[PDB]
Design a protein around this ligand. Structure first.
Ligand SMILES: CC(=O)N[C@@H]1[C@@H](O)[C@H](O[C@@H]2O[C@H](CO)[C@H](O)[C@H](O[C@]3(C(=O)O)C[C@H](O)[C@@H](NC(C)=O)[C@H]([C@H](O)[C@H](O)CO)O3)[C@H]2O)[C@@H](CO)O[C@H]1O
Ligand SMILES: CC(=O)N[C@@H]1[C@@H](O)[C@H](O[C@@H]2O[C@H](CO)[C@H](O)[C@H](O[C@]3(C(=O)O)C[C@H](O)[C@@H](NC(C)=O)[C@H]([C@H](O)[C@H](O)CO)O3)[C@H]2O)[C@@H](CO)O[C@H]1O
Ligand SMILES: CC(=O)N[C@H]1[C@H]([C@H](O)[C@H](O)CO)O[C@@](O[C@@H]2[C@@H](O)[C@H](O)O[C@H](CO)[C@@H]2O)(C(=O)O)C[C@@H]1O
Ligand SMILES: *[C@@H]1O[C@H](CO)[C@@H](O[C@@H]2O[C@H](CO)[C@@H](O)[C@H](O)[C@H]2NC(C)=O)[C@H](O)[C@H]1NC(C)=O
Ligand SMILES: *[C@@H]1O[C@H](CO)[C@@H](O[C@@H]2O[C@H](CO)[C@@H](O)[C@H](O)[C@H]2NC(C)=O)[C@H](O)[C@H]1NC(C)=O
Ligand SMILES: *[C@@H]1O[C@H](CO)[C@@H](O)[C@H](O)[C@H]1NC(C)=O
Ligand SMILES: *[C@@H]1O[C@H](CO)[C@@H](O)[C@H](O)[C@H]1NC(C)=O
Ligand SMILES: *[C@@H]1O[C@H](CO)[C@@H](O)[C@H](O)[C@H]1NC(C)=O
Ligand SMILES: *[C@@H]1O[C@H](CO)[C@@H](O)[C@H](O)[C@H]1NC(C)=O
Ligand SMILES: [Ca+2]
Ligand SMILES: [Ca+2]
Lengths: 172, 316, 318, 172, 320, 172
């Protein structure tokens, strides 16, 4: 996909994650946890809602009948209406297919972006104390209790606190 | 040896296939349909002053055929017509039938108006046909009268009448010209002497000549009666000379004309109907039929079109 | 040290719709739907012909209102509310067809019928509705057929126009329908009249009907008009014993031109290509909400008050 | 949004900044100073100018009138005319709403993109001499005068000039 | 002195210009056309039971013009009509002309059904004209009879002919009213009595009156035969009251199935196959748009007012 | 462009590369080599195949004649048909232009993003064993022979195997 995050460097999604669209799976000395990112999940869902608002609706235009159901009409103007109707349908059928294809493209890519944008937020927070895994993970090079993990998720992580310790571990 | 935090996205075992600009088999976590395929076999009639006409054809209402007795007048916001509706008791048709019938179905109401005509003993205006059943006995069109000689064969007087329009808006007048099945049936009714029909107004003038000739029997009568119609504008005298409408009619505002075979529903609200019922969908497109009336979803030549409401689905 | 990247913003941020958001704040925007109208017709660089009170059909007939507009070349014709092209009352058969056929054209050019009549026949019949130079007259390109001797039945005559031109001509004619027998019989005859026009690509029988009808312009009687298009190197024949009102000249319609129907005034210091009842539409924009009824090179009609096109990034204030 | 540079990791834009769309604000010994970027601010507008050139135009097609303004034409064809005139208007209405929506969507994200593209162009120049703040700022770990700061803005800065110095300032 | 690895995209020297939302002159690797400007000057008729009428007009297939003899009946799925074809050999017209040809051009065949109309000893049923020459001598429309009195001057006898539809599908009956050139002519053929032709069925009814009047000669005839038509539903019968001036039908037509209806000057080709046609010929393209003609028939790409629309099929071309 | 890769930090394309759309050039001790990435090439080809399957077709709507080629049509209905047909081919021209304009913009950006994605893939492979040139190259700080360069393209490069060697050369 456009942003290389979803069906990209991240190998697959998580049937496990039921409390949100995007989230974290951590692993430290003291075990493992899993929390869903609210702000990004709400961002995607807001954006999709805005689509359904504009897409699921109809014009407030009154269409009287122009062709009788229960009787015959002049053959040559019968042919004119059939032709105009088939044309007007051919437009609407095409316009409809294009809209949905275009939107489906945008929706997939927008969702791929919100994921990447979260992954970037995290890279910057962790600064020099972590290195990129390749598969959408960060190998943190200091001890990271649940409070230190929860600090990375809630964007309240100061790198300098753990910086001296991490640079040591990294350079070996 | 070092600790890990991992970024990831949700996923489901049962993803939906949608179409992007590039992919036709693009699997996503969720998608909702945008084309209504399922209809309801009923006519939504809530907050709508509906007026089912059943056996009554809308032309019949103005003309006064016995089936249209209940629907002779009224005000509504919606008009419903039916298959094999009876317009003419005695056989015939209407010059610009569908154009007239349109204006009835565009109009939200009809108000009849007494013309105030009187006659002599020479012409018997009150001609009753056995084709039109009313209350066991014979009868005639409620708002019309027949032009015939008191004694068959006698020369039909050339009486002429005119109707004033003292109303704010337009007035719709209709009159019946008869085409006999032969010379033998013509001589009785109007006399051997050849004769013309004509009309006059500030805008409308037209000659009418009866077409006499044999033809197949329709509703027990080989003879044929055809009804002509014209608007008459306020403060204008309508004058026609012939060798017979007691009441004219008037259309009231506007309303939606349905033309369906489906039954009505007490507590149903919609704005979109067709020959097969009402389409009550919140969806923008629909493939039920291209013939529809009222605020409607645009017809599309597509069974299904799926709109993704979630990201790419990728299981383990 | 420290170096920061950043973007401009504003105070009075302007709102625009997107695929996802109905209220997105951006720095700059631009309207794509023209809502402001103009009630003046703009005819710079245009050989226009303002008819005014003259109705298009009257130009072929030659009514006293359309004296100036009998001939000419143009690229635009204009028509007013209540334009009168009829002295003697009644409509013309297939009116709207002929009407727009005229308004489609870019000029009328006349050719002479060349119709001589017998010593007994008087061409110069007149009426009281149709007035030219103060007093009574008739239509300028027709002649009312009537016998000199009041009472004597008008004789069966045969007249024939011939189309010499390489193009087609529009031969108009008329038929008088009296309401009375008394002035009918002595003008024409006590007989029942026949009037049988005939061409190579047209034919018809006409019967001057008599009927009781409310008077119009002091006249109880009415006249109606019939027309056809005689072909290059073809002739038309008129057979009649009274009732017919044959033409002195027949019309040729030339080139192409717009047809505008409006009650608006005319300004020549302004140019435009989109018109309607209200006036002119002089805008670069792609859409408009003034009228669905327009002519020329128009913006499309859209059921939207405003549509705003973003010309700048998201406005992020503080 | 899509690129996460505007209403993104960049907290807010600058109301003080005019004669530019994107640019810089450095802090150093000499003191605080602002400056604009040309290559980025022009690429943005030129892209928008391209859009205005295409959307702000009409068809040259000449339409006659099919309806009499001062006469009511035959009731059945005036119904056919009304039905198409209504149908067409719903199409042009749908087409306008969809055009401006998707173009607005793309305008907004294209800008975000040019802001991201610059931030990345600066980052790759600075190489191992600076570190990302997270608010769209680069901390520099070597003394940087207005000559040094201008060499960043002008895409002329040399990383190897202050590398040995900076690395030991980062390691501490 | 480090080992370096570089990533890059391909390019080409002679790259193509395409239009984007933001740029009217954007150089890309490769591009394809979406509008067609190319038309075969042939009508491609492979896997089609087609019928070229030549100078036979479809309407002439029903009345029975000499030119339409090899077109009186048949089946097809495609029907080609040519410019200046012939319906009326004797001069005359048809009311609802454009409606009747359009109805014929929608069909996939014509059957012919005998009316079995009989006439009195006084009536000459074999009326003929020089305007319809056939097999050397004078003739008349195959599917109609010119009824004139056999005793020049004698008033045409009152007659009543009626056709019943015995078939399951509707039939297309049509007839002519003759309109003579002079009162001398009228009286010679039908006599002095006032003429009235009355026609009636369950669904149709109308009266016609011959028109006497001078008018130019066409195929060297001042007289005219205008044609009327109507459908006669299954079971129902149509009846002709007439006293002279009726061109009676000897046969009625049944239209069968559906067909595509092309008006074109371009010649047949049974080797080539198409499903889009126009005046100019065939359009066998796979493209979504076209700028040849806004008048086409069959499954066609959509006419656009555009010479060319190039669709990028590769990346931006940034060349060395 | 949007993704800054093509006509961006990669300054120009290689007219020499005839075996794919994206690929690697390297310089080591054995000398020089060029090669294409098959996977990321197909990624871009297969999305263009998608656009063409969906854009190269016509509606299967059968249309009949409403205008006669060889005979005069009624003036009234013919003015209606002319206006209808005009209004329809205005819609379809406008849709055709907008369609390709949008798809052209996407094809380009799509192809940009597939360059950026390959850059970020190998960036993440190399980890701390290399540094961003800024011109879309990775200066490797460990001896990388032809089997080493092969391992980068094949995506089998074990970064830890040359990590110690590479961090010494990064710092000094
Ligand atoms: C088999 C048979 O002939 N039985 C006769 C029967 O004919 C006759 O009654 C009259 O029959 C004629 C023949 O067609 C008509 O059908 C008459 O029908 C009516 C009608 O349609 O209602 C009766 C009505 O009385 C007539 N109108 C008036 C005002 O009187 C109308 C009308 O004039 C015309 O029919 C219009 O086309 O005709 C029907 O009366 C009787 C005679 O007593 O005797 C049977 O045994
Ligand atoms: C200049 C001159 O004197 N010419 C006459 C010439 O007209 C005439 O021949 C007949 O002329 C009449 C009237 O002009 C018709 O034109 C005749 O044509 C036919 C026709 O072919 O159509 C002959 C045909 O046999 C007639 N058939 C029937 C069934 O009646 C028809 C038909 O009646 C009319 O066309 C009706 O409009 O007319 C034409 O033969 C000859 C013979 O007197 O003398 C010339 O000098
Ligand atoms: C050519 C000619 O004689 N014209 C008359 C004209 C016609 O003869 C008449 O309109 C045909 O019906 O009649 C004009 O005026 C008439 C009055 O003189 C008569 O008393 O009243 C008539 C109507 O009630 C009639 O109008 C006319 O209409 O102009 C006079 C004109 O010379
Ligand atoms: C206009 O379109 C409709 C359908 O597309 C045509 O109606 C069909 O006609 C045949 C027989 O006449 C019926 O058996 C079909 O069932 C009809 N279809 C429907 C849905 O009613 C109609 O013929 C067309 N009109 C013209 C003038 O060609
Ligand atoms: C076509 O639509 C127009 C506009 O909706 C109709 O014109 C209006 O009709 C109403 C109701 O009869 C009139 O009272 C109004 O004065 C008209 N309004 C305008 C703005 O013109 C027109 O009647 C419709 N025509 C047909 C044949 O249905
Ligand atoms: C999303 O999925 C749920 C459960 O499958 C369903 O209720 C919902 O309607 C789907 N789509 C939307 C737009 O809510
Ligand atoms: C931006 O806004 C200014 C004034 O507010 C205006 O002059 C300019 O035209 C706008 N830019 C557009 C419409 O491209
Ligand atoms: C690209 O160009 C070549 C030759 O011009 C052609 O073989 C190839 O199919 C083109 N791509 C298309 C048409 O998609
Ligand atoms: C319809 O347009 C064509 C060409 O655009 C023209 O030849 C014709 O005159 C028009 N039809 C009518 C009846 O005006
Ligand atoms: Ca058809
Ligand atoms: Ca209406």
């Amino acid at each position: 996909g456009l942003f290389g995050a979803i069906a990209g460097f991240i190998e697959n999604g998580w049937e496990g994650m039921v409390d949100g669209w995007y989230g974290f799976r951590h692993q430290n000395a003291q075990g493992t946890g899993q929390a869903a990112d609210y702000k990004s999940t709400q961002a995607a869902i807001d954006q999709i809602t805005g689509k359904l608002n504009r897409i699921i609706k109809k014009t407030n235009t009154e269409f009287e009948s122009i062709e009788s159901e229960f009787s015959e009409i002049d053959h040559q103007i019968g042919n004119v209406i059939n032709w105009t109707k088939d044309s007007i349908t051919d437009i609407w059928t095409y316009q409809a297919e294009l809209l949905v294809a275009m939107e489906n493209q945008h929706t997939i890519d927008m969702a791929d972006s919100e994921m990447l944008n979260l992954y970037e937020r995290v890279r910057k927070q962790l600064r020099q104390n972590a290195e990129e895994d390749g598969k959408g993970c960060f190998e943190i090079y200091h001890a990271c209790d649940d409070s230190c993990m929860e600090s990375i998720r809630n964007n309240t992580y100061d790198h300098s606190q753990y910086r001296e310790e991490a640079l040591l571990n990294r350079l070996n | 040896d070092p600790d890990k935090i991992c970024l990831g996205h949700h996923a489901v075992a049962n993803g939906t296939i949608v179409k992007t600009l590039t992919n036709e088999q693009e699997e996503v976590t969720n998608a909702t349909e945008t084309v209504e395929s399922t209809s309801l076999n009923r006519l939504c009639m809530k907050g709508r002053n509906h007026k089912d006409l059943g056996n009554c054809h809308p032309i019949g209402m103005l003309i006064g055929t016995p089936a249209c007795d209940l629907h002779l007048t009224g005000t509504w916001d919606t008009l419903i017509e039916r298959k094999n509706a009876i317009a003419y008791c005695y056989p015939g048709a209407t010059v610009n039938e569908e154009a007239l019938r349109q204006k009835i179905m565009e109009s939200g109401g009809i108000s009849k108006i007494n013309t105030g005509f009187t006659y002599g003993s020479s012409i018997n205006s009150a001609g009753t046909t056995k084709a039109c059943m009313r209350n066991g006995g014979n009868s005639f069109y409620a708002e019309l009268k027949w032009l015939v000689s008191k004694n068959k064969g006698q020369n039909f007087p050339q009486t002429t009448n005119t109707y004033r329009n003292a109303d704010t808006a337009e007035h719709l007048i209709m009159w019946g010209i008869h085409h006999p099945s032969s010379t033998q049936e013509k001589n009785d009714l109007y006399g051997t002497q050849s004769l013309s029909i004509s009309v006059g107004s500030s805008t409308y003038k037209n000659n009418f000549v009866p077409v006499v000739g044999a033809r197949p029997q329709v509703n027990g009568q080989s003879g044929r009666i055809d009804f002509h119609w014209t608007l008459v504008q306020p403060g204008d005298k309508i004058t026609f000379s012939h060798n017979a409408p007691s009441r004219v009619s008037k259309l009231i505002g506007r309303g939606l004309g349905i033309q369906s075979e489906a039954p009505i529903d007490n507590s149903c609200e919609s704005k979109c109907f067709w020959r097969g019922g009402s389409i009550n969908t919140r969806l923008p497109f629909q493939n039920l039929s291209p013939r529809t009336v009222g605020q409607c979803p645009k017809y599309v030549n597509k069974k299904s079109l799926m709109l993704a409401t979630g990201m790419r689905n990728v299981p383990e």
